[PDB]
Amino acid sequence: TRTAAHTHIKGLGLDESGVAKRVEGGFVGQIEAREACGVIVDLIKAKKMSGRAILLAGGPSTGKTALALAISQELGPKVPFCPLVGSELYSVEVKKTETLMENFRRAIGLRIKETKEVYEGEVTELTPEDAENPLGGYGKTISHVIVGLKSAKGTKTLRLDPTIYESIQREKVSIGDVIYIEANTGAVKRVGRSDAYATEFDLETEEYVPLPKGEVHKKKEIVQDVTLHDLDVANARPQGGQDVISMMGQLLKPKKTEITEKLRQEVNKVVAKYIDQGVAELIPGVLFIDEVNMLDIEIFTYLNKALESNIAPVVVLASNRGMTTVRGTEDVISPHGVPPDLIDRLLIVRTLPYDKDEIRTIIERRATVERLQVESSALDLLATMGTETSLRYALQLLAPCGILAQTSNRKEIVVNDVNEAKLLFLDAKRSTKI
Amino acid sequence: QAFRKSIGIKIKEETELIEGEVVEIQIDRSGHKQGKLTIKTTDMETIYELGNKMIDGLTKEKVLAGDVISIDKASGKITKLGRSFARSRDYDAMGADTRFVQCPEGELQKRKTVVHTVSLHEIDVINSRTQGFLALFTGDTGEIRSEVRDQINTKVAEWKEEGKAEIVPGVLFIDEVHMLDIECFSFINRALEDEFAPIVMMATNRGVSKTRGTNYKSPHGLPLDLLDRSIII
Amino acid sequence: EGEVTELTPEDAENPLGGYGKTISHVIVGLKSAKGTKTLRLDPTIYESIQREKVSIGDVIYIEANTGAVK
């Protein structure tokens, strides 16, 4: 129901072993930028390089941010994408470098694929089997504990390691409870009374859960996605409980802290260990920093160092500026807002302005997105105005035109409504004139 | 934080409760204990059988006869609403905990759903720390983790997909926008474009003046990129 | 407010009436410049009395608004 500024951007719209179609995925034109984004996306999917920088350079409205959104969608939600604005780096609780490093490590992702075998049942039989004592002593010995489990269209009786007794004691399973038991771990959890005994007592505080479906033995593969920043935050934070450390943590508000290099190296080491064990996979991801002009010179120098880091994502930067002094410098007039040192480490891609037909196609597709109907003459007038003042100006004037048409009980936009909106809402140029 | 305050989330909660004045409680204990309990309303009376955990909760709440109590059959939590008026005469001074309430009417077991209006900023603050609801008033909330905000967006989307939560977008009004800095405007340029961005109205009185944080004059003190995505009245 | 003259805690008329200690109302006698009065108090007020460590002869101060004993 919402209509954001980029809802039409469904993807880059390339074809296998080919190029960008003229109109596909909501984009129109900008073929070169889409092809460059496609090759960059393929490189990122290759997952074999680190610290590759691209700069979306172009005039305002030229689709820079739309192109970053296209990259994000093309990689999909499975690849961890971390949008960020250059203004966001200037925190008050920590230094800028800390925020940049946290974002850098936030962009990298880890995928853990674990398969587990589990039995899960209400409990029926519970009978230990006596066996001869190797040490004698006239004592009563058991060699297995026997459990019977019921499930929809399933039942089995299991002989278990006697050690289960201690688990069963701790869990305090009773007959008629629904329990979770791990095939290799010997761990047990109970979660339920079966709904079949919910009628035995009119009142009971515990929650009765439906009996498990399927065969009692079920094999499930669980996939989880995590980021290095999440891991660091979890490891840098107290567990949380009744101990005094948690008490002083509750007293003092948790502010951001400079996570030491030791913790980062420890996290990297444990991640490497578990990856070598074969359970986890690494996903680099993309960190898009819009309005890269807003970064200070110190942030640029740390990017200079951080791009050389052995583990870093692919950074996409956008800039709408021309020849302006780099922030944090007094007399360094440089192309875009990027200082020359960072320019040497990045790649620039151009985003061309738009023609009349391109503006018209963009306007008609945007109107299609907003569930509006427009006449051909109204479309021509709208495109003329967009070429007269601004494209985004027309794309914003679209909605009040629809409201004005609705006020006339009409389901289609007419030139009169367009002129009415033009009179009501002034553009940037006409306001500058006043 | 200002932007999220301008968006509200209307969330529905379904509650099932039993409320009534307990008439008689009889508990027998050896093995596990068993007992029977009777609860009446203004137009109903019923005898119930109590499980071990229900009896434990009753004992740990120290409920007596003539008290109006509420039990959530999902969790079994027992809350003492108050005492009857008939027991008021029994003392000269009353404790802080005591309360006098009438006996509830109607059926003993009732189903009720309640709609709650909570802003996104409030949800983020509540879900950030263990005591964020105090920071919702104190204002010492700090810079919430971005991963928390993304998770909250995902959760709100999940609720909306399941149909138990509704979004009520609002209007953000910024008085004297020329008091902002260039960094704030550069953030706003992208921030206006989020799917959950509200509708922002901006009021200014300065004409062609010098933008704060820059060394040049501007048509209204705002960068041209922001004016591009702004209609001027 | 006044000076405590008597403090005679009472249990319920039946042992089955309550839980554990089964302590019922407490009777307190206060003395002032204009006379004496015998009060009947809630067990919560008795708990407040125990918390404040009040003995016979101590001048006390009970707020019926909140049940706070000083």
């Binding site: 519970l126 | 009889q26 | 089955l16």
Partner: peptide, 28 residues
Amino acid sequence: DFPNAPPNLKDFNTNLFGMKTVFHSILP
């Protein structure tokens, strides 16, 4: 048991796994 003696059978199974009124109240 320490003198190499077996325990009670019901106690054995209970340790392997792990009437009168007491409180009556009524409003007068």
